[PDB]
Amino acid sequence: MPQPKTFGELKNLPLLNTDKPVQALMKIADELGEIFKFEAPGRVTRYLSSQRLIKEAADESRFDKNLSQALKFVRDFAGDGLFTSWTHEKNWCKAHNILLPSFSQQAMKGYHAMMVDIAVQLVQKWERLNADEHIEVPEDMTRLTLDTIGLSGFNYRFNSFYRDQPHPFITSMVRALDEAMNKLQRANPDDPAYDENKRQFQEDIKVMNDLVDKIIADRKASGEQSDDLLTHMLNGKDPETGEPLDDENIRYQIITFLIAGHETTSGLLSFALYFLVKNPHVLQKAAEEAARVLVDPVPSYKQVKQLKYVGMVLNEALRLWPTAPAFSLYAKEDTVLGGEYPLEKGDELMVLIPQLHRDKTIWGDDVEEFRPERFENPSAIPQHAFKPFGNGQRACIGQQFALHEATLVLGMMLKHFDFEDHTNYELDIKETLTLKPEGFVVKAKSKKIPLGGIPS
Numbered sequence: 001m002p003q004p005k006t007f008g009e010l011k012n013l014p015l016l017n018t019d020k021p022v023q024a025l026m027k028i029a030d031e032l033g034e035i036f037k038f039e040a041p042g043r044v045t046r047y048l049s050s051q052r053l054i055k056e057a058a059d060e061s062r063f064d065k066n067l068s069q070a071l072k073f074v075r076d077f078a079g080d081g082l083f084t085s086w087t088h089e090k091n092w093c094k095a096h097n098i099l100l101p102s103f104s105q106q107a108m109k110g111y112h113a114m115m116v117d118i119a120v121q122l123v124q125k126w127e128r129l130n131a132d133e134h135i136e137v138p139e140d141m142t143r144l145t146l147d148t149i150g151l152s153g154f155n156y157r158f159n160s161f162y163r164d165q166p167h168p169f170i171t172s173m174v175r176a177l178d179e180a181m182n183k184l185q186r187a188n189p190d191d192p193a194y195d196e197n198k199r200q201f202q203e204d205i206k207v208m209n210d211l212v213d214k215i216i217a218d219r220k221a222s223g224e225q226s227d228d229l230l231t232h233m234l235n236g237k238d239p240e241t242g243e244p245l246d247d248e249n250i251r252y253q254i255i256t257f258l259i260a261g262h263e264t265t266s267g268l269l270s271f272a273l274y275f276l277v278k279n280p281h282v283l284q285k286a287a288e289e290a291a292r293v294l295v296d297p298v299p300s301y302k303q304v305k306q307l308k309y310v311g312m313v314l315n316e317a318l319r320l321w322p323t324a325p326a327f328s329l330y331a332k333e334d335t336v337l338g339g340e341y342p343l344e345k346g347d348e349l350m351v352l353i354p355q356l357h358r359d360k361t362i363w364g365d366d367v368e369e370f371r372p373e374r375f376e377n378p379s380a381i382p383q384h385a386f387k388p389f390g391n392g393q394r395a396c397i398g399q400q401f402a403l404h405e406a407t408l409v410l411g412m413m414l415k416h417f418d419f420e421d422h423t424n425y426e427l428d429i430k431e432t433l434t435l436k437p438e439g440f441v442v443k444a445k446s447k448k449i450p451l452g453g454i455p456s
């Protein structure tokens with residue numbers, strides 16, 4: 001097994017001493033191949049990059065979800081919510097059973113109207129820009145996605161479009177996540193210098209918790225019925241245990257869904273638009289579909305399902321830059337990987353998703369090209385070749401929510417504006433555990449098509 005350069009007792013750790021550790025690991029994967037060992041003091045991981053090995057790692061009877069060191073840090077504020085719990089923790093199975101029906105087709109049709117509310121707000125912001133102005137893409141996508149999960153899921157309005165800067169919830173989340181990514185790299189964690197980092201970390205957790213208080217308090221005082229994600233959190237009962245979720249876990253689920261429910265979708269929309277402006281025939285082809293399908297003043301649910309080519313664009317953006325670029329597994333038992341790499345019970349594997357998605361033996365030599373057509377026939381794609389939403393029972397529960405939201409929004413965008421890459425933007429990918437293209441700006445010239453009023 002290959003292993004990258006080492007530095008005495010620090011082993012491989014200094015290689016992650018960089019603002020872009022995922023991109024560093026991709027370069028390492030390129031040089032070393034499908035598997036490499038990565039050591040830090042008191043830690044060893046095996047990074048996987050080939051569909052061949054990742055298909056075995058995908059076997060749930062052999063491997064289960066691991067909370068990598070970073071998810072452990074996130075756990076300080078996300079606790080035993082769905083994302084940061086072990087598969088066998090009481091509250092994983094309990095919350096998964098309780099909340100799974102909140103992401104059914106029937107539930108998706110119910111979120112649609114509120115997804116439209118927020119999308120209308122985005123479109124109105126861009127219609128209302130003066131000729132001198134431009135769009136900050138990731139910043140506006142984060143306004144959109146945070147607002148959509150807040151409203152659809154919790155009947156709460158962050159009102160992100162009524163703010164020139166990020167919402168204070170975003171500012172604290174990003175700082176919290178950034179701090180988690182920083183702790184990894186500290187060879188000397190408890191040194192009194194990092195006490196300022198710790199104080200600020202608690203302050204950020206306080207900010208996120210105070211917001212959760214408001215979401216709970218606003219529901220308590222509602223008067224109206226919502227029948228949404230939060231209803232099911234508050235009232236749903238586990239079939240297999242007879243119990244509802246207790247108050248402590250509910251607070252962790254809310255934090256969990258606010259963060260997991262927006263951040264990566266914001267990244268996806270940003271990348272999608274990035275790829276659209278850099279590939280003019282794809283853009284025109286996507287715009288033509290949006291115009292052809294979106295005939296009413298606001299989009300209906302069924303129409304979003306018909307935005308087939310938009311779905312393909314979104315999938316091809318997840319292919320090149322999956323916005324949650326990594327997930328961790330551990331061996332349940334002593335086992336051998338690919339008939340060649342022996343693992344002991346509890347050994348860690350990191351699935352490096354952007355590299356999985358660049359496996360030339362699966363996609364072809366043209367992996368770097370943006371080509372939505374790869375997704376024309378989705379069942380043509382081998383199992384485990386394409387995993388932007390993770391794996392098995394620990395796969396993304398919000399997958400259809402994200403894609404429906406991103407398809408709706410990108411459809412409306414393409415219907416209502418022409419986009420211009422006026423700075424000739426140079427791709428610069430920022431890492432905060434998740435990925436987004438930093439400083440991506442465009443200009444949107446309105447096609448001046450009237451926008452319908454918000455349903456409900």
Ligand code: HEM
Nearest residue numbers: 082083260261264265324327389390394395396397398402
């Ligand atoms: C395109 C955007 C999204 C991407 C790329 C994405 C990616 C992922 C990945 C890779 C995992 C597995 C994590 C791991 O194995 O360590 C995951 C799980 C999860 N996702 Fe997403 N996700 C997205 C959107 C969403 C949305 C919109 C929601 C909520 C509405 C959501 C909620 C969750 C939750 C709660 C989990 C933990 C599931 C469990 O273990 O039971 N995600 N997601």
